Amino acid sequence: SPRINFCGNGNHILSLVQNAPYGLLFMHFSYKPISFKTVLVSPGLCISGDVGIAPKQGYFIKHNDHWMFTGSSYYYPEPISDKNVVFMNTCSVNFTKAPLVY
Amino acid sequence: AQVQIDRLINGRLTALNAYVSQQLSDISLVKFGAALAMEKVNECVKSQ
Amino acid sequence: AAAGIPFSLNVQYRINGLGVTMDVLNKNQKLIATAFNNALLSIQNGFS
């Protein structure tokens, strides 16, 4: 269910259940980050004909001087596409100006 | 004096038992409310 | 505690999810922010 801390704490992946004396014992499996990279992120971009784009469960990253997308829970720069973007007919203020994207 | 004090002891102990039973029942409602508040924290403030 | 994005963008995406076009939301950002802090002030003044 899309409920954040209902099935234990952290980034809950999945849960399993086992019988216990007078109850149930749940094993909550969570995604635990081990190491982190500090990166500069953009929560949105103003592209082409002033079209706004927002990242889906991620961020826009300047990688190799080019605008790229990365997931919010794992650093892996990948090209910006309709698969990882929410489109807007107008871009919001403070969205980074990127006329060269798409 | 023991007969009179015994009537008071019995009345006061009965009153403490009644208060204790009510306090157990009230704390059940407080636990229910605290669970709802934790659920509202998690599903309304930290996330939607 | 805001889904990893700025609070104003979280407010805008939450209002958009109700069936409100993003075009009125990103052009009325100041009106939305003023409505939000006026709602907070209304809650604070409501204790009087």
Next chain:
Amino acid sequence: LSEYGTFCDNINSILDEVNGLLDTTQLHVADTLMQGVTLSSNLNTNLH
């Protein structure tokens, strides 16, 4: 009262259990509020 029995021990035990439930509940609410909260060391109350 001492010749009455374990009545006062039982009253104290139930209230201690009720108060332990309130304490455990307060710790769970505080844990829920503080869960997943990551803040920057650059935050200051006088400027932000």
